[PDB]
């Protein structure tokens, strides 16, 4: 009866992993873009500027998107963890009437997910900072 819930949660984790990996890829792409922009600036050389400011604007836009997505993923992680807790409770009180390895695996999965998501958010913060620095540099 509860196996259905566990399976549901499992599939939800799978979806979460999909979305997460997508986010990661997007972040690495944006990483490359910023790097290019920085490398341009370090060089010792008015439309090129326009192109540059354009690039930075679009970079910003992409960052914003990624941040939004990541917020979504965070919230869905919270949901998954709520469900996990409810399952913990349900299995706990069902010790008056093993498959505990199941919720063990679910726990380990969600934990790994959480950690990876934290690293994601960290990376995002780092790109944020970089773009901001480039943005204040170009502002001069």
Half-sphere exposure of 120 (CA within 13 A, CB side): 26
Half-sphere exposure of 117 (CA within 13 A, CB side): 23
What are the residue ranges of helices labelled H in the chain? Answer: 3-42, 47-92, 100-138
Report resolution (Å) to 1 decimal.
Answer: 3.1
Please indicate the experimental technique that yielded this structure: X-ray
CA 95/CA 69 separation, integer angstroms: 39
The two tokens of residue 48 are 């090129």
CA 132/CA 140 separation, integer angstroms: 13
């Amino acid at each position: 009866g509860i196996e259905q819930k566990q399976n549901n949660l499992l599939r939800q984790i799978e979806a979460q992993q999909h979305l997460l990996q997508l986010t990661v890829s997007k972040i690495k792409q944006l990483q490359a873009r910023i790097l290019a922009v920085e490398r341009y600036l370090k060089d010792q050389q008015q439309p090129q500027q326009d192109k540059l400011y354009r690039e930075v604007a679009l970079i910003r836009a992409q960052l914003q998107k990624i941040e939004s997505e990541t917020l979504q993923l965070l919230h869905q992680q919270a949901e998954i963890e709520r469900e996990l807790n409810n399952q913990e409770q349900e299995i706990g009180s069902l010790k008056q009437r093993g498959i505990d390895q199941r919720q063990n695996n679910l726990k380990r999965a969600i934990e790994a997910q959480k950690h990876l998501l934290q690293l994601t958010v960290w990376g995002i913060k780092q790109l944020q900072a970089r773009i901001l620095a480039v943005e204040r540099y170009l502002k001069d």
